[PDB]
Design an enzyme around this catalytic site. Structure first.
Site: not given
Ligand SMILES: Cc1ncc(COP(=O)(O)O)c(CN[C@@H]2CONC2=O)c1O
Ligand SMILES: Cc1ncc(COP(=O)(O)O)c(CN[C@@H]2CONC2=O)c1O
Lengths: 414, 414
Positions: A363
């Site tokens: 992401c």
């Molecule tokens: C730094 C960070 N920000 C935002 C998010 C997303 O937050 P929510 O999905 O709980 O709303 C993640 C998790 N994202 C993980 C990181 O690796 N793949 C993922 O889906 C994250 O690691």
């Protein structure tokens, strides 16, 4: 060194299983965390004993459910050292909280010429809402550059943040590089220019202590599923003075005071930002997860993850043909790539050995382009991971290297 | 009459407890429903065996979690008879789904002179978003009047809906009056004038079969917590052609295709409307609740609730000084008031007898003003309620009447 990792693993039932004939080695906690028996049994007790709608105090089960929900709110408040429960808003997750900040604050405080400043290492949750906000307002989006080791220099922040900057949105810990960003100094820099600071703390909150009054962040977002808590719930912290001036992002029951045919007034904080029936069981389970982590101790968890990260970095450096991205000082994760092996195949072969890692863009596509790679692999750690699991990981990586070199010229022999 | 209510109650552990020394009589399912062991144990199995992030297919637990989540989506699709899983969006609840329709559709398809038409009996979740939308767009909000028995006439709909109406937002079943609204006929009327129809089905979905292709609704919102499912999850159905033209309400990971520095493209449906890590466990538990209800049979549940409603109406009519609001033909709930007794005190005295009812405005203040009352009490039924519980309710109401008449002039004796 007070932490007993075996006693901790004993509380996580999901760790005690086999995958493809091998003991499960879960190294994907940055994607989502696993839950101890305390959290699951909290959910069980809620659904078995006192499930009811909240915020009425009409009958006994309703009162118990309301008490659990608001007590979980207070637990969160003390967990991040917020001044008031009015500053703690239960949401769907970090993404929803950041979107709420972008909708209720950014789209109402941005004009042409204003700047929203982010970084190249931000996850998509901390990028797309600001894109849409500055597009709706005609503002300008700017990026703080990164050093060659994946960190941010304070002088680059002072350069990018100007007197026209109104919002600085930045990650506390990067889920890819493992970088711990200087959030406090960046908050002071943003305040010196008249800007607020939004902190994506989804990756920091599970693994290190959060002191919201010491960081002086204006907004702070976190996700329950990353910190041993139930899925579908997160927290938005905002300074009370800012939340009082923001209009609600959602409208409906529970967040209203008076409702006319055409106009309505809102509840006081924090319920102004909680429309409809809230995430009752999930919030109570997040409170249970907070109790669990605090009984273990966040400083302890962070020291354990520092040990794991140093060990993993050293053992990765013992492997030839493996590239690691990020700085030496880091959180408990390693993002890497094998030479001439696509990370997807790496992850497949590792899963064949019972090892669960991540492969893809995590992401963070602009960061992947900054790293000049299409995809990477990632092994992330939490409080239930051991150095023996990291040994299994590095041995599996060496065997993957050897196998893909063997297959390579065994049909060049063809 | 295939349903065995004792065998059904055996599956709900929360029903088998005492409150204030009396057996629990939970008559508040319109506020929230209770859960059978199937749903709770589904959540348990998820957190104990295959919790992981979804939509990657990288390792085994991730694949199992993704399969569970998307299988729950397919279960919902067949449960409401949607054409495609692309039309099924997992949300936080009915309120969030209605807000998504108001933000992504209403605020993008309303100009000055356009009309959004609702009713006086709508809950706040189906009122405030349309207020805010027509205010942001400069459109006009109109109300369909109600008959004296709390129902809606089709001619009043044809009168209120005009060629300038773009959206007709209406409840399928009223959580206060118990009215079942003519959703299919209203959908045809709205389509004849060039308007779409949004159906608040939070109170209908748990208690009666939903055929989205027969109702021809354009949008349909439902909540999991009302239908034996976990809290914090709901569903937005929208016709695929409409959802393809609507922009996302939230932005972040999982809902993106390409992410540039300033512009991004979205995933295909339904993931375009699901930002961040989804409500994995909650959605899987909602699928389990759907399996449970379908094994029992929604027509059976509706017939049982019709028996309960007729019995309750007859027994209420045997009480003097009790006013019941709504029509004779109704869903499984009774909203009422005792003469010269505030409904809050009614609910308190009933809870002292272990009986859980609702007292207040039920998130429907304009309806309360239309009823010329400040507050009401409400007893709502579900598949685990019996006629003996209704007997306990009416006996407690008679005793409350007698007690408040005794206290009345026993200090007039003073
Ligand atoms: C730094 C960070 N920000 C935002 C998010 C997303 O937050 P929510 O999905 O709980 O709303 C993640 C998790 N994202 C993980 C990181 O690796 N793949 C993922 O889906 C994250 O690691
Ligand atoms: C007809 C109707 N629409 C919308 C809602 C709210 O949906 P969510 O809260 O799941 O988003 C409810 C439940 N509201 C109940 C009715 O009584 N008190 C309540 O809170 C409802 O009965």
């Amino acid at each position: 060194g007070h932490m007993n990792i075996t006693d901790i693993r004993e509380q996580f039932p999901i760790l005690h299983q086999q995958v493809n004939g091998h003991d499960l080695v879960y190294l994907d906690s940055a994607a989502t965390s696993q839950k101890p028996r305390a959290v699951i049994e909290t959910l069980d007790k809620y659904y078995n004993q006192y499930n009811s709608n909240v915020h009425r105090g009409v009958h006994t089960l309703g009162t118990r459910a309301t008490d659990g929900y608001e007590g979980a709110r207070e637990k969160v408040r003390k967990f991040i050292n917020a001044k008031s429960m009015a500053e703690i808003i239960f949401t769907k997750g970090t993404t929803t909280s950041l979107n709420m900040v972008a909708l209720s604050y950014a789209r109402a405080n941005l004009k042409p010429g204003d700047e929203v400043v982010i970084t190249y290492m931000e996850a998509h949750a901390n990028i797309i809402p600001w894109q849409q906000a500055v597009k709706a307002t005609g503002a300008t989006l700017k990026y703080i550059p990164l050093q060659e080791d994946g960190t941010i220099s304070l002088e680059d922040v002072r350069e990018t943040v100007t007197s026209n900057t109104k919002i600085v949105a930045v990650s506390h810990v990067s889920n890819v590089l493992g970088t711990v960003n200087p959030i406090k100094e960046m908050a002071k820099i943003a305040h010196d220019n008249g800007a607020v600071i939004v902190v994506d703390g989804a990756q920091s909150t599970p693994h290190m202590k959060i002191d919201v009054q010491d960081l002086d962040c204006d907004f702070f977002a976190l996700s329950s599923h990353k910190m041993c808590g139930p899925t579908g719930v997160g927290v938005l912290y905002g300074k009370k003075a800012l939340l009082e001036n923001m209009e609600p992002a959602e409208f409906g029951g529970e967040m209203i005071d008076f409702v006319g045919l055409y106009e309505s007034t809102w509840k006081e904080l924090p319920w102004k930002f909680e429309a409809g029936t809230p995430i009752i069981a999930g919030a109570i389970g997040l409170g249970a997860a907070i109790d669990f982590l605090e009984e273990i101790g966040l400083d302890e968890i962070s020291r354990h993850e520092h040990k794991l990260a140093a060990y993993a970095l050293e053992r990765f450096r013992q492997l030839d043909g493996v590239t690691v991205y990020g700085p030496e000082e880091r959180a408990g994760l390693v993002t890497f790539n094998l030479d001439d092996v696509h990370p997807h195949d790496v992850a497949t072969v590792l899963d064949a050995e019972g090892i669960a890692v991540r492969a893809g863009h995590h992401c963070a596509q602009p960061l992947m382009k900054w790293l000049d790679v299409t995809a990477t692999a990632r092994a992330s750690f939490y409080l239930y991971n051991t150095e023996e699991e990291i040994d299994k990981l590095v041995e599996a990586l060496q065997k993957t290297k050897e196998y893909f070199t063997n297959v390579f010229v065994d049909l060049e022999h063809h």
